[PDB]
């Protein structure tokens, strides 16, 4: 609903990866400082600079 | 006897992956 590039990235952010957890839930993992997280980093965003 | 669904610690570290 409401197709727009307001808050959409697609294949996760840069340096990140979608890995499947032992429970089945796909968590996020960054490759910049080797640090994963349960929450969604690509979702927590609503502002930028241009 | 699990019960606890979310312990608190993040997923598997990249170093361990």
From Swiss-Prot, chain A:
Query: In what residue span(s) does the WW domain sit?
Result: 10-43
Q: Where in the cell is it found?
A: Cytoplasm; Nucleus; Cell membrane
Q: Which residues cross the membrane?
A: none
Organs and tissues of expression:
Ubiquitously expressed. Expression is highest in lung, kidney and brain.
Complexes and interactors? Interacts with UBE2D2. Binds, in vitro, through the WW2 and WW3 domains, to neural isoforms of ENAH that contain the PPSY motif. Interacts with BEAN1, LITAF, RNF11, WBP1, WBP2, PMEPAI, NDFIP1, and PRRG2. Interacts (via C2 domain) with GRB10 (via SH2 domain). Interacts SCNN1A, SCNN1B and SCNN1G; regulates the activity of the epithelial Na(+) channel (ENaC) through ubiquitination, degradation and intracellular retention. Interacts with ERBB4. Interacts with NDFIP1 and NDFIP2; this interaction activates the E3 ubiquitin-protein ligase and may induce its recruitment to exosomes.
Query: What further note is attached to this protein's record?
Result: A cysteine residue is required for ubiquitin-thioester formation.
Name the job this protein performs: E3 ubiquitin-protein ligase which accepts ubiquitin from an E2 ubiquitin-conjugating enzyme in the form of a thioester and then directly transfers the ubiquitin to targeted substrates. Specifically ubiquitinates 'Lys-63' in target proteins. Monoubiquitinates IGF1R at multiple sites, thus leading to receptor internalization and degradation in lysosomes. Ubiquitinates FGFR1, leading to receptor internalization and degradation in lysosomes. Promotes ubiquitination of RAPGEF2. Involved in the pathway leading to the degradation of VEGFR-2/KDFR, independently of its ubiquitin-ligase activity.
Record remark on domains: WW domains are involved in recognizing PPxY motifs in substrate proteins. The WW domains mediate interaction with LITAF, RNF11, WBP1, WBP2, PMEPAI, NDFIP1 and PRRG2.
Q: What is this protein called?
A: E3 ubiquitin-protein ligase NEDD4
Gene of origin? Nedd4
UniProtKB/Swiss-Prot annotation, chain B:
Query: What's the protein here called?
Result: Epithelial sodium channel subunit beta
As recorded in Swiss-Prot or TrEMBL, the protein's gene is named Scnn1b
Q: Which organs or tissues contain this protein?
A: Expressed in lung and epididymis. In the caput region of the epididymis, expressed at the luminal and basolateral surfaces of the ducts and in the smooth muscle coat. In the caudal region of the epididymis, expressed along the luminal border but not continuously, in the smooth muscle coat, in the interstitial muscle tissue and in sperm in the caudal lumen.
Biological role stated in the UniProt entry = This is one of the three pore-forming subunits of the heterotrimeric epithelial sodium channel (ENaC), a critical regulator of sodium balance and fluid homeostasis. ENaC operates in epithelial tissues, where it mediates the electrodiffusion of sodium ions from extracellular fluid through the apical membrane of cells, with water following osmotically. It plays a key role in maintaining sodium homeostasis through electrogenic sodium reabsorption in the kidneys. This subunit is not essential for ENaC function in airway surface liquid homeostasis and proper mucus clearance.
Q: Where is this region: Disordered?
A: 3-16
Similarity comment: family membership: Belongs to the amiloride-sensitive sodium channel (TC 1.A.6) family. SCNN1B subfamily.
For this chain, the Swiss-Prot or TrEMBL PTM comment says: Ubiquitinated. Can be ubiquitinated at multiple sites and undergo monoubiquitination and polyubiquitination. Ubiquitination by NEDD4 or NEDD4L inhibits the ENaC channel through endocytosis, intracellular retention and degradation of its individual subunits. However, some studies could not confirm the ubiquitination of this subunit of the ENaC.
Q: Where in the cell is it found?
A: Apical cell membrane; Cytoplasmic vesicle membrane
What stretch of the complete protein does the chain hold?
607 to 621 of 638
Q: Where is this motif: PY motif?
A: 10-14
Q: Coiled-coil annotation: which residues?
A: none
The organism named in the record is: Rattus norvegicus (Rat)
UniProt subunit comment:
Component of the heterotrimeric epithelial sodium channel (ENaC) composed of an alpha/SCNN1A, a beta/SCNN1B and a gamma/SCNN1G subunit. Interacts with WWP1 (via WW domains). Interacts with WWP2 (via WW domains). Interacts with the full-length immature form of PCSK9 (pro-PCSK9). Interacts (N-glycosylated) with BPIFA1; the interaction is direct and inhibits the proteolytic processing of SCNN1A and SCNN1G and the activation of ENaC.
